[PDB]
Amino acid sequence: MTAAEHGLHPAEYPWPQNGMLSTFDHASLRRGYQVYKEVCAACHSLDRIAWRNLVGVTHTTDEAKAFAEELEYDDEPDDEGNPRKRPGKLADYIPGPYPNEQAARAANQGALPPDLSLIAKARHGGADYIFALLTGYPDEPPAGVVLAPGMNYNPYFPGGGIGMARTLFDGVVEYEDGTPATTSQMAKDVAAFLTWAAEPEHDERKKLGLKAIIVISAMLGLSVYIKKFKWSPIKNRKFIYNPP
Amino acid sequence: MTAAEHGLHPAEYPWPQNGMLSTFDHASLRRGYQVYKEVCAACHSLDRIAWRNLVGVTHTTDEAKAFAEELEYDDEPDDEGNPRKRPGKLADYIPGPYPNEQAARAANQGALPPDLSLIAKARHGGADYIFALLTGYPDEPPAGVVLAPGMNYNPYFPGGGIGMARTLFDGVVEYEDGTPATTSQMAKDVAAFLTWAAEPEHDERKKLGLKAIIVISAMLGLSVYIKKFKWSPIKNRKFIYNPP
Amino acid sequence: KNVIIKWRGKPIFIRHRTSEEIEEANEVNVATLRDPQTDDERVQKPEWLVMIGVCTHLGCVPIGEAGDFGGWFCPCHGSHYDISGRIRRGPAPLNLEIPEYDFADAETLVI
Amino acid sequence: ATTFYNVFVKRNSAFVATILASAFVFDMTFETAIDNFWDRINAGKQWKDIRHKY
Amino acid sequence: ATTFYNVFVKRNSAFVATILASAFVFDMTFETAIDNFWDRINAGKQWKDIRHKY
Amino acid sequence: MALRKKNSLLNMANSYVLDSPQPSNLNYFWNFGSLLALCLVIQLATGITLAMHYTSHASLAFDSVEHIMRDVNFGWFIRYAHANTASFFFICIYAHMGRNIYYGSYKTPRVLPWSIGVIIFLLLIITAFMGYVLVFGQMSLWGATVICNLVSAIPWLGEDIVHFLWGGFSVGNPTLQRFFALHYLMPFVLAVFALLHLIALHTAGSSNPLGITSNVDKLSMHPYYSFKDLITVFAFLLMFTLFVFFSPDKLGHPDNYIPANPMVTPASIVPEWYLLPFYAILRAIPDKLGGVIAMVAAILILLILPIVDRSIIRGNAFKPISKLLFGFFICNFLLLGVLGQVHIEPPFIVLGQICTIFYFSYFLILLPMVSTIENIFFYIGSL
Amino acid sequence: YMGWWGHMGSPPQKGIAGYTISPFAARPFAGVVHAAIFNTFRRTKNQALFVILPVSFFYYVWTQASEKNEWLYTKAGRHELAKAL
Amino acid sequence: YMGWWGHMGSPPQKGIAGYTISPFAARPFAGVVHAAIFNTFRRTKNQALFVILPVSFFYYVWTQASEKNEWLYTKAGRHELAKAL
Ligand code: HEC
Numbered sequence A, B: 001m002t003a004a005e006h007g008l009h010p011a012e013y014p015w016p017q018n019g020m021l022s023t024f025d026h027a028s029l030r031r032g033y034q035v036y037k038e039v040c041a042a043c044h045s046l047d048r049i050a051w052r053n054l055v056g057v058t059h060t061t062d063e064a065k066a067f068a069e070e071l072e073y074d075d076e077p078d079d080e081g082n083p084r085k086r087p088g089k090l091a092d093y094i095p096g097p098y099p100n101e102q103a104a105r106a107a108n109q110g111a112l113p114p115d116l117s118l119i120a121k122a123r124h125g126g127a128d129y130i131f132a133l134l135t136g137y138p139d140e141p142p143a144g145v146v147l148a149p150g151m152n153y154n155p156y157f158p159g160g161g162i163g164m165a166r167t168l169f170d171g172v173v174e175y176e177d178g179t180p181a182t183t184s185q186m187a188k189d190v191a192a193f194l195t196w197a198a199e200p201e202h203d204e205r206k207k208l209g210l211k212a213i214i215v216i217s218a219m220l221g222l223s224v225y226i227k228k229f230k231w232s233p234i235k236n237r238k239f240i241y242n243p244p
Numbered sequence C: 001k002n003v004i005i006k007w008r009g010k011p012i013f014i015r016h017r018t019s020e021e022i023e024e025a026n027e028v029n030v031a032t033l034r035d036p037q038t039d040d041e042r043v044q045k046p047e048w049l050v051m052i053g054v055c056t057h058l059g060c061v062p063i064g065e066a067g068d069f070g071g072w073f074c075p076c077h078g079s080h081y082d083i084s085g086r087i088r089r090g091p092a093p094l095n096l097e098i099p100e101y102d103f104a105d106a107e108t109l110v111i
Numbered sequence D, E: 001a002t003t004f005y006n007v008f009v010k011r012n013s014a015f016v017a018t019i020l021a022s023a024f025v026f027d028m029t030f031e032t033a034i035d036n037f038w039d040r041i042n043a044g045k046q047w048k049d050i051r052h053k054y
Numbered sequence F: 001m002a003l004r005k006k007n008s009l010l011n012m013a014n015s016y017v018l019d020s021p022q023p024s025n026l027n028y029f030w031n032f033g034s035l036l037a038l039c040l041v042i043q044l045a046t047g048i049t050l051a052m053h054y055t056s057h058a059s060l061a062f063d064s065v066e067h068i069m070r071d072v073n074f075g076w077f078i079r080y081a082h083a084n085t086a087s088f089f090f091i092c093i094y095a096h097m098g099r100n101i102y103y104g105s106y107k108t109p110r111v112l113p114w115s116i117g118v119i120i121f122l123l124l125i126i127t128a129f130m131g132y133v134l135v136f137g138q139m140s141l142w143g144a145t146v147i148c149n150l151v152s153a154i155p156w157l158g159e160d161i162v163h164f165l166w167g168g169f170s171v172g173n174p175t176l177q178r179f180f181a182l183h184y185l186m187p188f189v190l191a192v193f194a195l196l197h198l199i200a201l202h203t204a205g206s207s208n209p210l211g212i213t214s215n216v217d218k219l220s221m222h223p224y225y226s227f228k229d230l231i232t233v234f235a236f237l238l239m240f241t242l243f244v245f246f247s248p249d250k251l252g253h254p255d256n257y258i259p260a261n262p263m264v265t266p267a268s269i270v271p272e273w274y275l276l277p278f279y280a281i282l283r284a285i286p287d288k289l290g291g292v293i294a295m296v297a298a299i300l301i302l303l304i305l306p307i308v309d310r311s312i313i314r315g316n317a318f319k320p321i322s323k324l325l326f327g328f329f330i331c332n333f334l335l336l337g338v339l340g341q342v343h344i345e346p347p348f349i350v351l352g353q354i355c356t357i358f359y360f361s362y363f364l365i366l367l368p369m370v371s372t373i374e375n376i377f378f379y380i381g382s383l
Numbered sequence G, H: 001y002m003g004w005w006g007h008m009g010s011p012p013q014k015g016i017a018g019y020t021i022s023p024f025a026a027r028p029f030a031g032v033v034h035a036a037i038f039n040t041f042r043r044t045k046n047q048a049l050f051v052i053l054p055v056s057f058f059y060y061v062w063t064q065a066s067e068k069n070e071w072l073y074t075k076a077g078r079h080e081l082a083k084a085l
């Protein structure tokens, strides 16, 4: 296919979490959550993440409960069977900006902003793709590209025409930790955040893998000693033949 | 337990469908549907039955479509993502009188009228229990029974006090076939109807069972001939012993 | 006042019982009780009656404050529960079950 | 009757072919026969008996 | 060192008991050692490192 | 040499189903083995089919079973066949065990097939209990609640174990999903053990109703027992047909057609009929832990029959006193069954305790006494 | 303990002559009427006691127990029930 | 075709004496360095062609195909692509 049809393949950036021994930077994850909440959440849902998931990753229990309690969720009906709302709890899922697909598409000139809970695993490239995409809107589309109406040019997106406009501009977010909120900083943070959302066990997984690698390496070394020890009678065997 | 606590056990009535070779009387089923629709459906749902299930049992396709098309059901949202209703189709399920349990209980002084799709299989007694219950409200509770407020005495119901009032009175329904709508006639019809609802394969099941009984009986007879034929050498064996 | 908290779909009655309510409950001789228990067995704190607000008969929810022993009245078959939530009159065999609840703070309980 | 044996039974290929053809015919006729029998013992009861009113 | 053999290895019951006790100790110490190592190579990155701000 | 003997694969089939040497005098009670194999095949066929239509989520399980009954072509049949064959499986298994006890199939040299058999019996109980829960009707739920709360009586760890099995604090969605997976698996484990008890039996061959050696007079398994097994297959299928087509709910409990409701408790929680004797044994002991141990011991005690039967003669065909004792044992086992489904009321409480003592005393006292005395009577009587 | 055809593990047999006829030469139903009536009567009569005694005893036990239970939960049986609890 | 210990189906063996020492009497790692270096070199050298020839050929094929494909879907390759379809 033409490279246009595939999309430009994203650069390999050195993410903090790349590397067999490396966790996420949780301060980046927290910054990234703030980007999601102030920018992406306007159009994109994060349906697979519950408030409880942020606790002990990005937020304390109190901060997360505060976020949950600011929202209203559907309760069980009252005693007259009339519908009711309740304040959110830690077990609640982070709510979407739209009630259904149709509402979502109507607000986005037909395009459906996907759920971002898995988007880091659901695209070739992962964090690098998300970072590349958000930072890769050129000021001007390459001369001679024909964009459909309501499309924006982005070379990393397959086909080139994406229904999502550039959204990150210097200082759209005010980070609470005093980090300069540059386009690239915000994209790095939110891309890290979304990667965590897709794979929240990532830190635990790689620690257990370190333990497993060490034990299995030792057992591999020892298994070879034991095999050679038990086989030495057979390898060392000699014959003396006297034809009868 | 006290017999009160168990409930009086219902009589064995000779239903048309009792008997290995007997189907339901479908004219009774149709009459019973009319009782359900005009009396029971005020409080009880029939959630497991779709309009299509009445077709070729009680109603023609046209009559059933007419019943479905009179109702409104939840459609997929419109293009602005606003909720919408549509007219019913044959694949739709017969809708309940209440949106939820809470609404149901609030309308019935706390008691929850159960769904009747399975009630004939879900009680000891089946059709006989339903018939006995609907016809078994005495004019006066036996002297010395203390009914709780909003309870009605019915000996067939375990405990005696049922939250469902007597509902069948002579001429509450006007049958379309000119059958006199007496309490007993209506109870017989509706109990038959509910029995069909619980087990709609009943007629097919018993016809295939007749075929199965006949084939398996013949094969049983033949299997015995064949076994005796193959075993006759062994059964017929005789010995002559000459001690050596 | 009595609150109704859903907890695993089942309703939880939490009553903030007054002094005189506690007194009324501490009266009934244990002897004459389908399910013999005293309020002290039921509550771990006399000001917090916490029960699973499902009637022990079939499983309707009793309407509180109503009754004949002025606690809870199941409208379904007319069983009356107490200010301890003990069964007094009607078909119900047992007293309204007590969940495992702990006072983490004096102002918050977990169930 | 030797003829009958020789044709349909002696060769197993023929015997099994005869059994399967018989099974086909039995299956078809038995279906039809049960259908008619069932309709007579349950006369005026089934949908097909009341359908004419509609 | 004959002593060591005689006590811990000669009887299989003793050998397996020694193996399992060693496994228990290894398991416990290795867990703790990995935990500390993991915290040092990922310093300032984990929640426990930023939690103090809150 | 004939292919069926030459080829290693064919030879294994041959050794079990064709040239297998059997005693020439096995009576109809030797046919329950093949009926249990037929039940196991029907359960696999119907079970796998139901699994294609069932959804293990608790919000949908009961509805999926209604979907099977109402929407799936022949769904009603596959569901009722599976549910009723579970009853027939236990009729056949009790018959098969009864035959083994009466004819002393548990004695040397067949202790091994017998002992594996006792494990098959345990797996069948577990299999059928979990399958019952999958419907997620009221009997499903309240059965899982009560039975898994017995495990709470295991001291110290019991509570933790229960919550671990449920996957939660009560019977709910996690429980249902895990029971689905296990109920799918357990029948394959059961089939493997069924095959192991046969392989174990192959060393001694089948016992026979006279309890003597059959080495003197053997008959190939086919065609003699093949065609004898067809008689009981057709007899079984006649009984199956009467239940499945004409009375599909006669063996069941209507309460399971009410969707599970953790609030409402059913009128009476009684298990499926085939568990009832064990349930009566459990109720007989007042202590919770005692009751559970007794209930498990009621099954495991079968493993000591090889020890406590002290007879020099195999089986009961020739032992009039043992036959009477066995009759009393079997009738008591049925009375236990009936006491499992009455209410916990006088005078059935005391009666259940007497029947439970009689059940255990058969293995521990009576069989050892009676078998010792009969030894002496045979010897003195024939002098 | 059990061998296979040709070394089954029978003590040596000698001097038994066994005879039988083909299934096609025999009447498979010969004397079935006589057997179904006289033979089944003989075999049943010989085993009747071993079934009838335990069944009749346990039926009587159940009957006594079920009748007592029923009577205890009547009005007449209120007092006897009160003592039994 | 294969028997079991004691009747394996070997032709009769005679006059072979086999000797070995205990695993505890041997160094299991004796001459490992020599083998790891010299023996592996020998064995690899002897088999190298059977791997290198097919792998190098199929790698070259793939390389030619992937480079052509890439070139056909450029601007420069428009005409050659048009003919190829
Ligand atoms: C006001 C609208 C809007 C905002 C703000 C927005 N998006 Fe999107 N986004 C979209 C739409 C519409 C699409 C789908 C575009 C398409 O399929 O043509 C989309 C697509 C995406 C995709 C997937 C592209 C693909 O390969 O399918 C990612 C990843 C993404 N957005 C992330 C973000 C992040 C991260 C932010 C902000 C930090 C963000 N979006 C802000 C509307 C938005």
Ligand code: HEC
Pocket (backbone or CB within 6 Å): B035, B036, B039, B040, B041, B042, B043, B044, B108, B111, B112, B113, B114, B116, B119, B123, B130, B133, B134, B157, B161, B162, B163, B164, B165, B167, B190, C076
């Ligand atoms: C206006 C109310 C009302 C009407 C009309 C009504 N029911 Fe009910 N029904 C109830 C209530 C409430 C219950 C539950 C009673 C209880 O649990 O105490 C109930 C229970 C039942 C039960 C189950 C009783 C049990 O065993 O749990 C059946 C069967 C039943 N109704 C059938 C019918 C039929 C058939 C009709 C009319 C043809 C009917 N009902 C009309 C309110 C009604």
Ligand code: HEM
Pocket (backbone or CB within 6 Å): F029, F030, F031, F032, F033, F034, F036, F037, F040, F093, F096, F097, F100, F105, F106, F110, F113, F114, F116, F117, F118, F120, F121, F190, F194, F197, F198, F201, F205, F206, F207, F208
């Ligand atoms: C799926 C369950 C089972 C299957 C399919 C099965 C099948 C069989 C079969 C086919 C035989 C040989 C034929 C026969 O005697 O009937 C047999 C024999 C036997 N089975 Fe079972 N069996 C099962 C369960 C059990 C159980 C639960 C026990 C014991 C508690 C048991 C103990 C035996 C014994 C001891 C024999 C040898 C009996 C003898 O021939 O003397 N089996 N079984």
Ligand code: HEM
Pocket (backbone or CB within 6 Å): F040, F043, F044, F046, F047, F048, F049, F050, F051, F054, F065, F079, F082, F083, F086, F089, F124, F127, F128, F129, F131, F132, F133, F134, F135, F183, F184, F187, F188, F190, F256
């Ligand atoms: C020994 C084998 C088996 C036994 C004794 C057994 C027993 C049962 C029982 C008793 C039920 C409850 C039936 C009811 O009342 O509806 C059931 C349900 C079920 N079984 Fe099995 N089963 C067996 C094998 C299998 C197998 C192999 C599967 C393969 C998945 C399976 C799948 C199911 C399913 C999906 C249900 C739920 C649907 C239903 O209730 O009908 N079963 N089983």
Ligand SMILES: CCCCCC[C@H]1C(=O)O[C@H](C)[C@H](NC(=O)c2cccc(NC=O)c2O)C(=O)O[C@@H](C)[C@@H]1OC(=O)CC(C)C
Pocket (backbone or CB within 6 Å): F012, F013, F016, F017, F022, F026, F030, F031, F033, F034, F036, F037, F040, F191, F192, F194, F195, F196, F198, F206, F221, F225, F226, F228, F229
């Ligand atoms: C096809 C070859 C694979 C070997 C295993 C298949 C089955 C097999 O061996 O069949 C045999 C026919 C066997 N019957 C007997 O032993 C038998 C012996 C003597 C008398 C009678 N009856 C009297 O008249 C018998 O019924 C049987 O039904 O046992 C099944 C359970 C076996 O299934 C398995 O274990 C595997 C799995 C499906 C349980």
Ligand code: FES
Pocket (backbone or CB within 6 Å): C055, C056, C057, C058, C059, C060, C074, C075, C076, C077, C078, C079, C090, C091, C092
């Ligand atoms: S349900 Fe509570 S009173 Fe019967």
